[PDB]
Amino acid sequence: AMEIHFEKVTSDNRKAVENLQVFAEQQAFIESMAENLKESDQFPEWESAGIYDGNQLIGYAMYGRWQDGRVWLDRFLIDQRFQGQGYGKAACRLLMLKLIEKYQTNKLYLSVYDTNSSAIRLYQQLGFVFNGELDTNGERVMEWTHQ
Amino acid sequence: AMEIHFEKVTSDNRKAVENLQVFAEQQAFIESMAENLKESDQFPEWESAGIYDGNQLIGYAMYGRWQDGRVWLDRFLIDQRFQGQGYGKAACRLLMLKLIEKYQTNKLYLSVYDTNSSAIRLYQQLGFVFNGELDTNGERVMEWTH
Ligand SMILES: [Cl-]
Ligand SMILES: [Cl-]
Ligand SMILES: [Cl-]
Ligand SMILES: [Cl-]
Ligand SMILES: [Cl-]
Ligand SMILES: [Cl-]
Ligand SMILES: [Cl-]
Ligand SMILES: [Cl-]
Ligand SMILES: [Cl-]
Ligand SMILES: [Cl-]
Ligand SMILES: [Cl-]
Ligand SMILES: [K+]
Ligand code: NA
Ligand code: NA
Ligand code: NA
């Protein structure tokens, strides 16, 4: 019957884990977000934010200065009820400007999966370019430079 | 009118953020999971594992013993393809036994959202009980004492 075992995440299975299908587990993603928030609250390097249009919460973002001094956009979500209507790009641009005002640097960093075309296009339109680096999770790094 | 602004997450809006309707966004999940793995790999307290049935990846776990001294079950997911087949109970039970061996403790902790009926049931069936504590995110803590 069942042969349940656990494996450390490595390059051999990381992408399989990243592609775990979970597109109905509404209660599960509640738990995912609660942990997301807990993990951000744990370390002062990280900060979570709700994204609002007026009084309506439309999304979420996590970001922060990592130890190397690089500033990262770690998570960025728009609620499904509000997608396809220019919120992501508008919110992402504003977040970018807030980050480079908060911190000294004029560079921001993120990493993307090699198939997330909907997101890559958004970040590309906002000035993010692939910089030839790989993140620790094997994702391709993108970098926004201000000038 | 479009009026975009950003608010710190506090008790005023945390549960609103926790309930963001992002459960139908496939590509968003890949990034969410990738970020989970990045954060897990960063801190030695935390460990991520794939859950397998033989050669089939069926789920994901994240767990850690933090500076406080308690061992937590931080993240636990079963792929929606293999839901409702008993993999939740069996894998969680096996994971519990792994952690009390790996660490010195005979206790394990998790926290759950109140409206999560399946989770509270599942965890209770395995021996977890509400211990009257609140987590940092406002979730009710459950505890399993071996
Ligand atoms: Cl195992
Ligand atoms: Cl695999
Ligand atoms: Cl849009
Ligand atoms: Cl590019
Ligand atoms: Cl490149
Ligand atoms: Cl703002
Ligand atoms: Cl608060
Ligand atoms: Cl998608
Ligand atoms: Cl979870
Ligand atoms: Cl299950
Ligand atoms: Cl109980
Ligand atoms: K999770
Ligand atoms: Na990333
Ligand atoms: Na780790
Ligand atoms: Na929790």
CATH number of the domain to which A39 belongs:
3.40.630.30
Q: Is residue A24 part of a domain?
A: yes
Q: Is residue B1 part of a domain?
A: no
Which of A10, A37, A117 has the highest number of chain B CBs within 10 A, making it the mutation to test binding with B?
A37
Range of the domain at A122: 14-145
Q: Is residue A4 part of a domain?
A: no
Tokens at A13, concatenated: 């299975």
Tokens at A9, concatenated: 């995440």
The SS3 assignment for A145 reads strand
Among residues B60, B63, B113, B123, which one is catalytic? B123
In angstroms, the CA B138 to CA B13 distance is 11
* Number of Cβ within a 10 Å radius of residue A113: 20
Which of B79, B94, B137 has the highest number of chain A CBs within 10 A, making it the mutation to test binding with A?
B137
What is the layout of strands, in order, in the sheet containing B71-78?
A: A4-8, B46-53, B56-65, B71-78, B107-112, B140-145, B129-134
How far apart, in Å, are the Cα atoms of A90 and each of A116, B96, B144?
19, 44, 45
Resolution in A: 1.5
**CA dihedral in degrees (B73, A74, B12, B29; nearest 10)?**
-60
In angstroms, the CA A97 to CA A106 distance is 9
Helices and strands, counts by H and E, chain B? 4, 7
A21 Cβ under 8 Å from any chain B Cβ: yes
In angstroms, the CA B36 to CA A75 distance is 10
Smallest CA–CA separation between B42 and chain A, in Å? 9
In angstroms, the CA A69 to CA B127 distance is 44
B44 Cβ under 8 Å from any chain A Cβ: no
Q: Would you say B109 and B73 are in contact if contact means Cβ atoms under 8 Å apart?
A: yes
Q: Would you say A135 and B38 are in contact if contact means Cβ atoms under 8 Å apart?
A: yes
Close Cβ partners of A112 (under 8 Å, ≥ 6 residues apart): A119, A120, A123, A139, A140, A142, B31
Q: Is residue B87 part of a domain?
A: yes
In angstroms, the CA B60 to CA A143 distance is 30
Q: Is residue A88 part of a domain?
A: yes
Query: Which of A86, A27, A87, A85 lies closest to A58 in space, CA to CA?
Result: A87
Helices and strands, counts by H and E, chain A? 4, 7
Q: Is residue A90 part of a domain?
A: yes
Q: Is residue A83 part of a domain?
A: yes
Close Cβ partners of A31 (under 8 Å, ≥ 6 residues apart): B75, B76, B112, B113, B116, B119
The SS3 assignment for A37 reads helix
Residue-wise over B52-67: b if at least 16 C-beta within 10 A, else e? bbeeebbbbbbbbbee
B47 Cβ under 8 Å from any chain A Cβ: yes
After what residue numbers is chain A broken, C–N > 2.5 angstroms? none
Way it was determined: X-ray
Number of domains in chain B: 1
In angstroms, the CA A128 to CA A108 distance is 8
Q: Is A60 a catalytic residue?
A: no
Q: Is residue A81 part of a domain?
A: yes
Question: Which parts of chain A are beta strand (E)?
Answer: 4-8, 46-53, 56-65, 71-78, 107-112, 129-134, 140-145
| Phi-psi region at B37: left, alpha or beta (left = phi > 0; alpha = psi -120 to 50) | alpha
Residue-wise over A8-45: b if at least 16 C-beta within 10 A, else e? ebeeeebbebbbbebeebebbbbbbbbbbbbbbbeeee
